Amino acid sequence: PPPLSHCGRAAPCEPLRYNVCLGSVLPYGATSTLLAGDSDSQEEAHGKLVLWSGLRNAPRCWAVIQPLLCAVYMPKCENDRVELPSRTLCQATRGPCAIVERERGWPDFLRCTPDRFPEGCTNEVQNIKFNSSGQCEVPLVRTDNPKSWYEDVEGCGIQCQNPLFTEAEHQDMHSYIAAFGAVTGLCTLFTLATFVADWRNSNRYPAVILFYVNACFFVGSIGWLAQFMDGARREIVCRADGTMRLGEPTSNETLSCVIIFVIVYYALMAGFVWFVVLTYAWHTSFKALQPLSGKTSYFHLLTWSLPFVLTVAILAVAQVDGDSVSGICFVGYKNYRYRAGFVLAPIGLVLIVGGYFLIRGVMTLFSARRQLADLEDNWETLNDNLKVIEKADNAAQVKDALTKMRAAALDAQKATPPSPEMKDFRHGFDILVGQIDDALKLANEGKVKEAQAAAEQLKTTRNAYIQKYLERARSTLSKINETMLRLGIFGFLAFGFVLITFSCHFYDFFNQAEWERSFRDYVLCQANVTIGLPTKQPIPDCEIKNRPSLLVEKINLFAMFGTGIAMSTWVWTKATLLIWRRTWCRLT
Ligand SMILES: CC(C)CCC[C@@H](C)[C@H]1CC[C@H]2[C@@H]3CC=C4C[C@@H](O)CC[C@]4(C)[C@H]3CC[C@]12C
Ligand SMILES: *[C@@H]1O[C@H](CO)[C@@H](O)[C@H](O)[C@H]1NC(C)=O
Ligand SMILES: *[C@@H]1O[C@H](CO)[C@@H](O)[C@H](O)[C@H]1NC(C)=O
Ligand code: NA
Numbered sequence: 001p002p003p004l005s006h007c008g009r010a011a012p013c014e015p016l017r018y019n020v021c022l023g024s025v026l027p028y029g030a031t032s033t034l035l036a037g038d039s040d041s042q043e044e045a046h047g048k049l050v051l052w053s054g055l056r057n058a059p060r061c062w063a064v065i066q067p068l069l070c071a072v073y074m075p076k077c078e079n080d081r082v083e084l085p086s087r088t089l090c091q092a093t094r095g096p097c098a099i100v101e102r103e104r105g106w107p108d109f110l111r112c113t114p115d116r117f118p119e120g121c122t123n124e125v126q127n128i129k130f131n132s133s134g135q136c137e138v139p140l141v142r143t144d145n146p147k148s149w150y151e152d153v154e155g156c157g158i159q160c161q162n163p164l165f166t167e168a169e170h171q172d173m174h175s176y177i178a179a180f181g182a183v184t185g186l187c188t189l190f191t192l193a194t195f196v197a198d199w200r201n202s203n204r205y206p207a208v209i210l211f212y213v214n215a216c217f218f219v220g221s222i223g224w225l226a227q228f229m230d231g232a233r234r235e236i237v238c239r240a241d242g243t244m245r246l247g248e249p250t251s252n253e254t255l256s257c258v259i260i261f262v263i264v265y266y267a268l269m270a271g272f273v274w275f276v277v278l279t280y281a282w283h284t285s286f287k288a289l290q291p292l293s294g295k296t297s298y299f300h301l302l303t304w305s306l307p308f309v310l311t312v313a314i315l316a317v318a319q320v321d322g323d324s325v326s327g328i329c330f331v332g333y334k335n336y337r338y339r340a341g342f343v344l345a346p347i348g349l350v351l352i353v354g355g356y357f358l359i360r361g362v363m364t365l366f367s368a369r370r371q372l373a374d375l376e377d378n379w380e381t382l383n384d385n386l387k388v389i390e391k392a393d394n395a396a397q398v399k400d401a402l403t404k405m406r407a408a409a410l411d412a413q414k415a416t417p418p419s420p421e422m423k424d425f426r427h428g429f430d431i432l433v434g435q436i437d438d439a440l441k442l443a444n445e446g447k448v449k450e451a452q453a454a455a456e457q458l459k460t461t462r463n464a465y466i467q468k469y470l471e472r473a474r475s476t477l478s479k480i481n482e483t484m485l486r487l488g489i490f491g492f493l494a495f496g497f498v499l500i501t502f503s504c505h506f507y508d509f510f511n512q513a514e515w516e517r518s519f520r521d522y523v524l525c526q527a528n529v530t531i532g533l534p535t536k537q538p539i540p541d542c543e544i545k546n547r548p549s550l551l552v553e554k555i556n557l558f559a560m561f562g563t564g565i566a567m568s569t570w571v572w573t574k575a576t577l578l579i580w581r582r583t584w585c586r587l588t
């Protein structure tokens with residue numbers, strides 16, 4: 001059919017200086033630089049095409065932009081008429097070539113204006129075959145799976161091996177994980193083995209808490225050591241295409257990533273709540289001076305249900321991501337805001353709850369130990385001053401000893417153990433002070449013999465009321481055994497590592513914002529530095545502003561695996577040597 005008067009524009013034709021347009025030979029011989037606003041010359045138009053050929057990277061955009069660019073920069077001109085590109089040719093780029101409007105914006109002549117791009121025009125570029133599909137620039141890899149595509153750059157996905165770190169750093173972090181993972185694995189297994197060998201004696205609170213603590217660090221170690229199996233790391237971290245496993249469970253991928261995630265994360269969070277059960281056990285152990293065997297229902301409910309709820313909540317929002325350096329799948333690697341709510345929030349909480357029971361625990365210990373020490377001090381002041389009154393050859397010696405006794409009795413009256421028991425204790429000293437005041441009156445009158453005799457009566461007021469409560473105060477504090485204080489030592493030892501773990505995830509969370517910015521800028525640099533560069537000069541490589549600290553990661557792994565080793569030393573006693581020697585004697 002004859003061409004529409006509107007699907008063309010009046011422009012003087014000039015012969016084509018280039019027989020080829022972006023790698024494809026042209027079916028016509030004349031062109032016009034009227035459609036390209038940025039160009040006035042054919043040489044200028046060609047140079048702009050070299051700038052636009054920088055979109056070779058991001059194939060989904062390159063596939064549709066190629067016919068549009070030839071239709072604008074090198075269009076067909078015949079008998080003082082240039083053929084305009086159709087609207088459908090222009091509109092087809094808007095979607096995949098979203099990278100253009102995000103960075104430099106679409107030029108005025110390349111915006112789909114009803115005038116600049118009329119509807120249903122015979123494009124002519126439809127007859128030209130653009131064989132070039134496109135390739136992905138480092139650190140992106142070519143993929144046709146849409147679930148793996150990196151933001152606006154369609155057709156490209158981030159490579160499986162962490163681009164922010166070298167192979168030297170990869171092997172170094174793997175050797176670090178191999179060393180800490182295996183020793184924790186052997187330490188926890190040995191500890192679990194002693195517990196099951198003497199199961200009926202071992203299965204008793206609070207000793208049984210550390211078994212379940214070691215159980216968590218053992219299961220967790222299995223997940224961390226999984227990657228060291230022949231080609232397992234790539235089965236857990238890499239996608240089918242060759243990209244990083246991000247946004248899992250997804251659909252068409254293997255469960256190998258989510259399986260390792262559940263193994264690591266569930267065991268991690270179960271280990272932190274079992275630590276809180278330990279801090280609570282040590283808190284309530286001083287309140288026995290209420291058995292823990294009854295509260296087993298509350299412990300096993302919270303320690304196994306709460307990590308399950310969090311594991312399920314992550315798999316629902318699908319935030320399971322894989323990392324090649326760590327060699328495991330975890331929550332919030334890509335979306336760090338999810339790592340704050342599922343890693344920093346529960347670790348922040350266990351520090352508050354666990355910390356409270358550890359602080360209130362020593363507060364109960366040091367308060368009860370001081371109250372006894374102060375009572376013993378006042379009790380000894382009374383006994384020492386009684387001897388002074390017995391030996392006193394004058395009333396000034398009797399008066400001075402009694403005033404010191406009055407101050408000691410009133411001070412010891414204020415003392416409270418950690419009420420009808422308090423009523424008789426306070427009244428016991430009320431009688432004594434009242435008797436001291438009567439003895440002081442005799443000393444003030446000068447009656448030494450009468451004040452000395454009145455002082456002998458204080459001895460029985462002390463034995464009848466005071467002595468009965470002093471023996472009780474001593475017995476309650478004697479009830480504090482070594483296993484009780486050892487539990488607290490382990491509690492603070494575990495608290496330390498949890499405080500370090502928190503600080504590491506807090507550092508990663510605080511600086512991820514810039515690490516992602518430094519990455520996007522690095523990726524965009526790889527496509528910018530390739531364009532607008534002299535033909536003779538080799539392409540200079542781009543750099544990353546900032547990346548995660550491998551030292552902070554190593555400190556986090558030391559804190560995580562450190563707890564697993566430190567909690568395994570609960571069975572490094574005399575009694576556990578007996579269990580292995582008696583089983584060895586049974587075998588041979
Ligand atoms: C991740 C990668 C693929 C995205 C980066 C694509 C780069 C190469 C794109 C994005 C915006 C583009 C520019 C948008 C506008 C113009 C104006 C025109 O007069 C000459 C070309 C030029 C300057 C384009 C050249 C290529 C460009 C810089
Ligand atoms: C390269 O050019 C684009 C133009 O849109 C710009 O947005 C981008 O930031 C540039 N890259 C660098 C690293 O400056
Ligand atoms: C390039 O074109 C030829 C035909 O000219 C075709 O056989 C080949 O497959 C094309 N290349 C690609 C990668 O499509
Ligand atoms: Na022009």
Ligand code: NA
Pocket residue numbers: 248249250251252253254255258
């Ligand atoms: Na899956």
